[PDB]
Amino acid sequence: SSLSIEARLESIEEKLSMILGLLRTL
Amino acid sequence: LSIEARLESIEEKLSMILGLLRTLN
Amino acid sequence: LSIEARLESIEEKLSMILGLLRTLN
Amino acid sequence: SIEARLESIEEKLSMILGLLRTL
């Protein structure tokens, strides 16, 4: 926390992309 | 690179994950 | 339309994913 | 509450991540 909304959101999005990449291998 | 643009993309990803998960064997 | 509206929707999707992920185990 | 929403979202993500590893 204390990283701002813009930077905090970047990570959420990059974490979701990882999950999608991993899921698409099934 | 906009809060609105970033959020839309996030929403898309979540729905995609849900769609992929519903089909999970 | 509106950050708060999307954020609520995003939160709802995350909860759904959690339930499913817990269900798969 | 926005700053509060993000914290809640961030916490759901952690569980999801952990659960993926449990797969």
Numbering used by the authors:
A (entry chain G): 168 to 193
B (entry chain F), C (entry chain E): 170 to 194
D (entry chain H): 171 to 193
Pull text from the paper.
The P protein is thought to be responsible for the recruitment of the large polymerase L onto the viral N-RNA template through direct interactions with N and L. In addition, P chaperones the nascent N, which is sequestered in the form of an RNA-free NP complex. The analysis predicts the presence of a central, highly conserved region with α-helical propensity located between residues 158 to 237, which we refer to as Pced.
A single diffracting crystal of HMPV Pced grew after 140 days, suggesting degradation occurred in the drop prior to crystallization. Diffraction data were phased by molecular replacement using residues 169 to 194 from Pcore, revealing a tetrameric α-helical arrangement consistent with the modeled structure. The asymmetric unit contains 2 tetramers, with a solvent content of 40%. The residues 158-168 and 195-237 are absent from the structure, in line with the flexibility observed for these regions by MDS and SAXS-based ensemble optimization. Additional stability is provided by a solvent-exposed network of ionic interactions created by Glu173/Glu177 and Arg175, or Glu180 and Lys182 side chains from neighbouring protomers. Comparison with representative models from the SAXS optimized ensembles, as well as with the best scoring models from MDS demonstrates Cα RMSDs ranging from 0.9 to 1.6 Å over aligned residues, confirming the accuracy of the modeled Pcore. The structural data presented here indicates that the α-helical tetramerization domain of HMPV P (residues 171-194) is considerably shorter than the highly conserved central region of the molecule (residues 158-237). Interestingly, the sequence of Pcore aligns with a region of RSV P that is necessary for coimmunoprecipitation of the L protein, suggesting either direct binding to L or the requirement of a tetrameric P protein for efficient P-L association. The short tetrameric coiled coil from HMPV P clusters in a separate branch from SeV/MuV/MeV and RV/VSV, emphasizing the pertinence of its classification as a separate subfamily, Pneumovirinae.
